[PDB]
Amino acid sequence: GVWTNIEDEILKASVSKYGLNQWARVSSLLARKTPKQCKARWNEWLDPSIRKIEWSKDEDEKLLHLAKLMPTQWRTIAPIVGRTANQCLERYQKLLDEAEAA
């Protein structure tokens, strides 16, 4: 289900305690969140290396050049555009959705 501003605060404080690679203990301090869901939420949001600002179109153009160059791998675009792979895939679909509408 959804992630509340409270559950992320418990996730951050729990991650600081048991590190990464310890998600059953991390999940234990949560009520209705699986260990995998905690890994997802830190890998897609809580990690401070993930960007929080809107996509710059400098980042959109970087994403467009590399998706046409290498459509055979998505975890390959990510180490160059400072976002996650799953964020890259979904942002590319939006840029395709917006083009299709025009």
mmCIF file of C-alpha atoms in Angstrom:
data_model
loop_
_atom_site.group_PDB
_atom_site.id
_atom_site.type_symbol
_atom_site.label_atom_id
_atom_site.label_comp_id
_atom_site.label_asym_id
_atom_site.label_seq_id
_atom_site.Cartn_x
_atom_site.Cartn_y
_atom_site.Cartn_z
ATOM 1 C CA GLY A 1 0.000 0.000 0.000
ATOM 2 C CA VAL A 2 0.962 3.671 0.279
ATOM 3 C CA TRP A 3 3.925 5.003 2.304
ATOM 4 C CA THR A 4 3.032 7.532 4.986
ATOM 5 C CA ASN A 5 5.324 10.328 6.121
ATOM 6 C CA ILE A 6 5.412 8.462 9.438
ATOM 7 C CA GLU A 7 6.418 5.097 7.962
ATOM 8 C CA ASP A 8 9.333 6.673 6.067
ATOM 9 C CA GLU A 9 10.609 8.246 9.299
ATOM 10 C CA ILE A 10 10.566 4.841 11.002
ATOM 11 C CA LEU A 11 12.225 3.351 7.911
ATOM 12 C CA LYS A 12 15.026 5.931 7.961
ATOM 13 C CA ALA A 13 15.649 5.529 11.697
ATOM 14 C CA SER A 14 15.553 1.733 11.386
ATOM 15 C CA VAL A 15 17.938 1.736 8.398
ATOM 16 C CA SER A 16 20.387 3.833 10.437
ATOM 17 C CA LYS A 17 20.242 1.057 13.068
ATOM 18 C CA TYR A 18 20.474 -2.247 11.105
ATOM 19 C CA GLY A 19 21.978 -0.910 7.885
ATOM 20 C CA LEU A 20 21.108 -2.157 4.449
ATOM 21 C CA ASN A 21 20.977 -5.906 3.863
ATOM 22 C CA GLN A 22 18.822 -6.415 6.986
ATOM 23 C CA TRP A 23 15.236 -5.920 5.839
ATOM 24 C CA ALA A 24 13.391 -8.468 7.998
ATOM 25 C CA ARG A 25 14.579 -6.590 11.094
ATOM 26 C CA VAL A 26 13.739 -3.345 9.293
ATOM 27 C CA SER A 27 10.301 -4.682 8.386
ATOM 28 C CA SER A 28 9.728 -5.779 12.000
ATOM 29 C CA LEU A 29 9.576 -2.170 13.212
ATOM 30 C CA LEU A 30 6.776 -1.541 10.670
ATOM 31 C CA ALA A 31 3.154 -2.670 10.850
ATOM 32 C CA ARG A 32 2.052 -3.507 7.277
ATOM 33 C CA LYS A 33 5.236 -3.255 5.178
ATOM 34 C CA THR A 34 7.167 -6.254 3.836
ATOM 35 C CA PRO A 35 10.971 -6.509 3.939
ATOM 36 C CA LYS A 36 11.024 -6.220 0.143
ATOM 37 C CA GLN A 37 8.746 -3.150 0.317
ATOM 38 C CA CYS A 38 11.254 -1.518 2.667
ATOM 39 C CA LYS A 39 14.122 -2.238 0.281
ATOM 40 C CA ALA A 40 12.013 -0.754 -2.540
ATOM 41 C CA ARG A 41 11.102 2.367 -0.551
ATOM 42 C CA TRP A 42 14.715 3.081 0.424
ATOM 43 C CA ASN A 43 15.995 2.258 -3.079
ATOM 44 C CA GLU A 44 13.302 4.410 -4.754
ATOM 45 C CA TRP A 45 12.889 7.244 -2.280
ATOM 46 C CA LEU A 46 14.579 7.380 1.108
ATOM 47 C CA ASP A 47 18.154 6.934 -0.090
ATOM 48 C CA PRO A 48 19.701 10.440 -0.049
ATOM 49 C CA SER A 49 21.521 9.710 -3.297
ATOM 50 C CA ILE A 50 18.153 9.617 -5.102
ATOM 51 C CA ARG A 51 17.215 13.009 -6.523
ATOM 52 C CA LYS A 52 14.018 14.617 -5.254
ATOM 53 C CA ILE A 53 13.623 17.557 -7.660
ATOM 54 C CA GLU A 54 11.574 17.456 -10.854
ATOM 55 C CA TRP A 55 13.247 16.133 -13.989
ATOM 56 C CA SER A 56 15.324 18.728 -15.779
ATOM 57 C CA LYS A 57 15.059 18.518 -19.550
ATOM 58 C CA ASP A 58 18.822 18.281 -19.567
ATOM 59 C CA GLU A 59 18.097 14.967 -17.826
ATOM 60 C CA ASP A 60 15.247 14.249 -20.259
ATOM 61 C CA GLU A 61 17.514 14.697 -23.287
ATOM 62 C CA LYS A 62 20.167 12.495 -21.668
ATOM 63 C CA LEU A 63 17.474 9.864 -21.094
ATOM 64 C CA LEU A 64 16.247 10.139 -24.693
ATOM 65 C CA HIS A 65 19.724 9.822 -26.278
ATOM 66 C CA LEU A 66 20.616 6.733 -24.242
ATOM 67 C CA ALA A 67 17.268 4.926 -24.636
ATOM 68 C CA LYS A 68 17.549 5.068 -28.402
ATOM 69 C CA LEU A 69 21.210 4.015 -28.220
ATOM 70 C CA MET A 70 20.745 1.060 -25.839
ATOM 71 C CA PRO A 71 17.187 -0.284 -25.579
ATOM 72 C CA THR A 72 18.629 -3.727 -24.690
ATOM 73 C CA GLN A 73 19.249 -2.774 -21.025
ATOM 74 C CA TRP A 74 17.593 -0.329 -18.565
ATOM 75 C CA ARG A 75 19.867 -0.738 -15.526
ATOM 76 C CA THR A 76 22.459 0.538 -18.048
ATOM 77 C CA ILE A 77 21.045 4.062 -18.530
ATOM 78 C CA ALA A 78 20.781 4.587 -14.736
ATOM 79 C CA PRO A 79 24.514 4.881 -13.812
ATOM 80 C CA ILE A 80 24.711 7.910 -16.199
ATOM 81 C CA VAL A 81 21.414 9.719 -15.466
ATOM 82 C CA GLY A 82 21.418 10.253 -11.702
ATOM 83 C CA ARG A 83 18.069 8.463 -11.210
ATOM 84 C CA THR A 84 17.014 4.874 -10.652
ATOM 85 C CA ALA A 85 16.284 2.456 -13.500
ATOM 86 C CA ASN A 86 12.596 2.166 -12.607
ATOM 87 C CA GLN A 87 12.399 5.964 -12.520
ATOM 88 C CA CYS A 88 14.145 6.003 -15.931
ATOM 89 C CA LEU A 89 11.663 3.550 -17.450
ATOM 90 C CA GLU A 90 8.612 5.394 -16.143
ATOM 91 C CA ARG A 91 9.926 8.818 -17.115
ATOM 92 C CA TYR A 92 10.620 7.511 -20.632
ATOM 93 C CA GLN A 93 7.049 6.212 -20.924
ATOM 94 C CA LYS A 94 5.729 9.655 -19.953
ATOM 95 C CA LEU A 95 7.917 11.354 -22.587
ATOM 96 C CA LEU A 96 6.508 8.799 -25.040
ATOM 97 C CA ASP A 97 2.949 9.343 -23.754
ATOM 98 C CA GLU A 98 3.308 13.113 -24.157
ATOM 99 C CA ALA A 99 4.692 12.770 -27.699
ATOM 100 C CA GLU A 100 1.887 10.392 -28.674
ATOM 101 C CA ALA A 101 -0.677 12.940 -27.501
ATOM 102 C CA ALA A 102 0.983 15.461 -29.854
#
